[PDB]
Structure formats: C-alpha cells, structure tokens
Design a protein around this ligand. Structure first.
Ligand SMILES: COC(=O)Nc1ccc2c(c1)CCCCCCC[C@H](NC(=O)/C=C/c1cc(Cl)ccc1-n1cnnn1)c1nc-2c(Cl)[nH]1
Length: 238
C-alpha cells in the first residue's frame, strides 16, 4: 500500500495472506474470507501455480512475523478461476479458494459481506484498500498490514485515465486525482472494503494499475457486485 498507515489488530478480520511454498515460502497475494471455507481473491495471483498443494492461507494475521513453521494455516482444496479470465487488464480477475477445513469465526477472523445486487446504485464514500504490499514500485513486502482510504472514481473518469484500455463496468476504480495513496505490488487479491450503513461490504478486489499511486492513474479493482451470482454459483452448488 502506498501512502497508508498501520492497521490495528482485528481491524480487517476478513483479510488473509496467501503464501506459496514453492520454491521457498513467501507471501503471494491478499484475499478475503467470504464464507467458512471460501476466500475471494484475484485470478492473476495464480499465474504459473500448477496445484493448490503449494498454497497456504493465513487468517487472523496482523504482522507477517507471526508466520513461522509452527503457525496454523488453511490448506487449499481447489482453485476456481473465472472461465473468461485471460489477464488482469481485460477483467474477469476473480478467483475462489475452497479451503480444506472450515474457518472458525471470531474477533480475529470473520467474513465480509458481499455487496447486494440491489446496492448497484449506492454511492460508497468510506472505502479502504489493505495489504502487506510495497510502499512504492521498488520496495519489499511490509510486516504490518497497511490501510489507505481512497475515493471511488466513476467508470467514465477511469476510462479517461486509461485511454489505451477498455475499462468495463465489471471494473471499479479508486484513487485521488493527485495520486499518493494506492495499492502496490503484493496487495493484489486483497479487498477494497467500503462501509455503508455501518456494515462493511467487499466492493473490489485489488487488480492492477499503471505504476502505484501516480497522479491521474487510479487503481483498478474487480467490481465484486457484478460477480455475486458467479460467486453463489460456485459456493452454493447443489
Ligand atoms: C517476500 O515475499 C515477496 O516479496 N512476495 C511478493 C512480492 C510482490 C509480489 C508477489 C509476491 C506476487 C507476484 C506474483 C502474483 C501477483 C502479480 C501481480 C501483483 N500486483 C499487485 O500486487 C498489484 C498491482 C497494482 C494494483 C493496483 Cl489496484 C494499483 C497499482 C498496482 N501496481 C502497478 N504496479 N505495481 N503495482 C504483484 N505482486 C507482486 C508483484 Cl512484484 N506484483
């Protein structure tokens, strides 16, 4: 996260850190708990990942230093990537992880609500992007989970900022015209969380941008409300 501040423990209890163990163990991406065996994340995180066996999901984490060989994690039974996904910049950047065991909810780990299809017309004014990513393009993963408050940008304005891309209504953009606060490398797959009527909703999934926090280059997120039915198809299958 660029221009962020440290989170306090339990502030974002749906945030997870997804690690890969191959060739060595390290943080790969963020994700969000959406159900008791389900993480919602970005499809691009799995480029070159040939099996769910190399993944570990850690929940209830503030600091990456909490993770050692003896730290509990959730294994991944299945990686579900949207069938129309080709690359982040074209959209459909969404994936589900089905966990091998169930998450026991509590004050350190619990799900975030999905947006309501009836809330496609709400104006969210209290949105935050979180993660352990870099603070600038050439940096390193941060120990403490960071947070930054960022305003949503209309599709028309976002399209003006990315003249050479097709910014669809399945994407949602966020950032200041002047730049300075954004997601960065290592934040992808995590949430863009917005508080509406005292309830947090998962509005976006951190996806891509041109550089980090640049003037007139908002971050581009998967627009989760446009995928609620896809999520229910995969997670509530008969
Ligand atoms: C010690 O552990 C580490 O160092 N781990 C570790 C360290 C870093 C990384 C990995 C692991 C995962 C790489 C492969 C999958 C993921 C590949 C893409 C991913 N992108 C993002 O996270 C965000 C992008 C992004 C998103 C928004 Cl909304 C706005 C601007 C953005 N940026 C544009 N340019 N930079 N940011 C990424 N993540 C990393 C890089 Cl390197 N790039």
């Amino acid at each position: 996260i660029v221009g962020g501040t440290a989170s306090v423990r339990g502030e974002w209890p749906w945030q997870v850190t997804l690690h890969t163990t191959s060739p060595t163990q390290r943080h790969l991406c963020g994700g969000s708990i959406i159900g008791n065996q389900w993480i919602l994340t970005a499809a691009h995180c799995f480029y070159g990942v040939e099996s769910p066996k190399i993944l570990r999901v850690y929940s209830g984490i503030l600091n990456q230093s909490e993770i050692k060989e003896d730290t509990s994690f959730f294994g991944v039974q299945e990686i579900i990537i949207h069938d129309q996904y080709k690359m982040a910049e074209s959209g459909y950047d969404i994936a589900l992880l089905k966990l091998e065991t169930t998450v026991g909810y509590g004050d350190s780990q619990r799900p975030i609500c999905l947006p309501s299809k009836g809330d496609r017309n709400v104006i969210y004014t209290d949105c935050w992007v979180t993660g352990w990513g870099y603070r600038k393009l050439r940096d390193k993963i941060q120990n403490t989970l960071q947070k930054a408050k960022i305003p949503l940008v209309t599709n028309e304005e976002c399209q003006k900022r990315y003249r050479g891309h097709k910014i669809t209504h399945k994407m949602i953009c966020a950032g200041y015209r002047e730049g300075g606060k954004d997601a960065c490398k290592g934040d992808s797959g995590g949430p863009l969380s917005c508080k509406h009527n005292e309830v947090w909703h998962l509005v976006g999934i951190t996806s891509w941008g041109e550089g980090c926090a640049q003037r007139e280059r908002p971050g581009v997120y998967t627009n989760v409300v446009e995928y609620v039915d896809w999520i229910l198809e995969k997670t509530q299958a008969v």
